[PDB]
Point group: C3
Chain length 282, copies 3
């Protein structure tokens, strides 16, 4: 994906919707119903958009929806792309660069995750304060290759990547809507997958300071920071990681999506208030 | 590798052998003599099987041996494929899909490993109870890409991957044949190699909970679990990891292969009786 | 990059300089002025060398300089190649195989790094005593693929990779030139980049025993060891890693390169005394 190609995707969309969102939202496993709450919608199935990858995972509808979320224009990825589907991280992160070119100044990244922190409960929302990019340590980063200064600088720091003020405002909101007890804040990691983690892997990740284990988001976030966007992200805790050889393990994708589906009203209200906050501060 | 190509390999072999084994065995460095103890054998050089990779590593003979191991039909990879040879993990693990299509319900994977646990000794057999897939964390996984459901599900859990009942029976067997003082049980990891680990690496890997350090196996067993195969695995400790800047280090592939070669009797007997337990249990 | 191609490159240079150096030097970020202290130079822009990558990083000049360092013939990479540029590790490390083919017995690898050890100070030189190759754990190694025995063995051990005796002489030189308090010794790791590390990543890397965090060197050293070369390496600490969500982060490539430029006299004297030691001892 060159700059020119990405700008063709952006123009393609800007000619076909009048909406000019300042916020992009990526909906993960069981979070796709965020997109169903928008009004005055212009919708584009991924398989119809030039150069666009398709979502092959169940519960990822595969649709870019422009609409109003409680009156605020947003761009919504209803469905994400994952490295385990065979997509390089630059390709999974490509919509973030499209968002940036469309004029989004903010990225809200959303995902399902397993709770490696044993104090978490299924159904909790964990604010991502930080991440550990293991893929990146190994050389697998979406920014590898020639750098285009029209997007951003060759090198950049990660301080405040997960915006501290939006994280603090999300705590204020959680308490307004009565979900503070189901609200966490901690560290996310993105692993290859598609298999889930062994007991030894979960022990190692957790001792290194990981609270939530998923398979996305980090490379999306790094692409967003590269081009100057403000990021906010959260994990819905859809299952607890297996902590012992003694525990019965029942990890199931359908149940994992189910967790989010059953919380669609609360998630929608939560994201809706975050977006409201971003809009009024601007 | 498509399901159709793999089925073609399976059909090619099944047309050239009368044997219908329920157990695939993979022999690692110094374990190649397991194949030599089979009776009434149909043997296939890797060079001659369609689409098959070749063993380039010393002590890896490079042939697929169907035969009887104490009267039980087995198929045996005499020599394996390593990622450091330049094969993608899916290519290294492809024989597991062939075993499955042939009708193997069980995979026994064997390997050489450096002992990172300083309680171990050269010549110990360490039952693999669990692994840590650092390659998979970084996105290097044999299941990356489109998922064929004729093999297995998109996602799956890792609990009980190294079958607990078979590890238990291996402890029983170790007692029967006098080797309980050379029998450990612990956590394996598969590194890229082909260089051996530095002192700082070994310390980091111990602290994360690794007992045995190798360069194979993990993706073979991930491929088997995806197929729904039951897995049993062990490492022969062929050398102790260097643990200080003061220890003299003498890691040598020829010596490493020799550790297994000098234990062929015991290894054959140990593996033969696990296979026997599997046969009797169906 | 085959042996024959590498010999093409070696022969190309050997035809165009009469210098026969025994020591190769790679200059990293802020260390390029080392090449400027050479006398009687034959200089080659990377652009003009057959099959050579080019340096795209600010402050990496991109010239191979054959010259005298205080009377000792050296071969000096003024600027290097990084994986985040899009170069595979074997391509970043390729100039090390050329140095060997030319007759270099020693590699001096220098880099800039972030101080993860909080007792380090900006401007310190950390001798590399060891490294943790996280790229290699995942399978990203310059030696992956067929092995040519004309360079070295399939497998080899890492003990004393960073030469203990040269590290000892460095400590003696440090006191001779008045920089003993600014001399450290510890463990280096090579991350993919190009972004710098999160707070959570720096914490995890410290915990695992890393003192200095960089993006180069490790694969150059592994290639050198493969060839049988003696290796000496150090990091100039150009910035402290961010260790808290409360500190102000000002990671800047221009400043980083500036730390070395501001120390060119010292760096040159230090390196010049090491080469003088290698030369006398031989
Ligand atoms: O326990 C886990 N480990 C890794 N990822 C997840 C996720 C996140 N998603 C959900 C989905 C498979 O259910 C895949 O895209 C990763 C939920 N739970 C876990
Ligand atoms: O100390 C070790 N580190 C990593 N792997 C091994 C192995 C396993 N095999 C042995 C073989 C090189 O001797 C290569 O295929 C990996 C034995 N000892 C060690
Ligand atoms: O804090 C750090 N983290 C990772 N690498 C470096 C380096 C080494 N170089 C410097 C350069 C970016 O300034 C890139 O080539 C990596 C200096 N400081 C840091």
């Amino acid at each position: 994906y060159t700059y020119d190609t990405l700008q063709e995707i952006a123009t393609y969309l800007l000619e076909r919707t009048e909406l000019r969102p300042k916020v992009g939202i990526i909906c993960g496993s069981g979070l796709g119903t965020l997109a169903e709450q928008l009004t005055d919608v212009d919708s584009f199935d991924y398989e119809t958009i030039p150069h666009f990858p398709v979502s092959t995972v169940a519960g990822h509808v595969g649709r870019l929806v422009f609409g109003y979320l409680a009156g605020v224009p947003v761009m919504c990825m209803q469905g994400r792309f994952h490295h385990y589907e065979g997509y390089p991280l630059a390709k999974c992160a490509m919509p973030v660069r499209v968002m940036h070119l469309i004029g989004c100044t903010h990225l809200i990244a959303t995902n399902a995750a397993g709770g490696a922190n044993p104090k978490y409960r299924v159904g909790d929302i964990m604010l991502i304060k930080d991440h550990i990019n293991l893929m990146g340590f190994a050389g697998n980063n979406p920014l590898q290759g020639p750098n285009d200064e029209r997007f951003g600088p060759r090198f950049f720091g990660m301080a405040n990547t997960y915006d501290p003020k939006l994280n603090q405002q999300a705590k204020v909101i959680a308490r307004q809507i009565g979900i503070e007890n189901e609200l966490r804040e901690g560290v996310y990691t993105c692993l290859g997958g598609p298999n889930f983690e062994t007991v030894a892997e979960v022990k190692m990740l957790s001792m290194l300071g990981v609270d939530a284990i998923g398979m996305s988001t980090v490379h999306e976030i790094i692409t967003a920071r590269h081009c100057g966007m403000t990021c906010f992200a959260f994990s819905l805790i859809t299952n607890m990681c297996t902590m012992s050889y003694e525990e019965e393990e029942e990890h199931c994708h359908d149940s994992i999506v189910g967790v989010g589906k059953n919380r669609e009203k609360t998630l929608g209200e939560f994201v809706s208030r975050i977006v409201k906050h971003i809009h009024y501060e601007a």
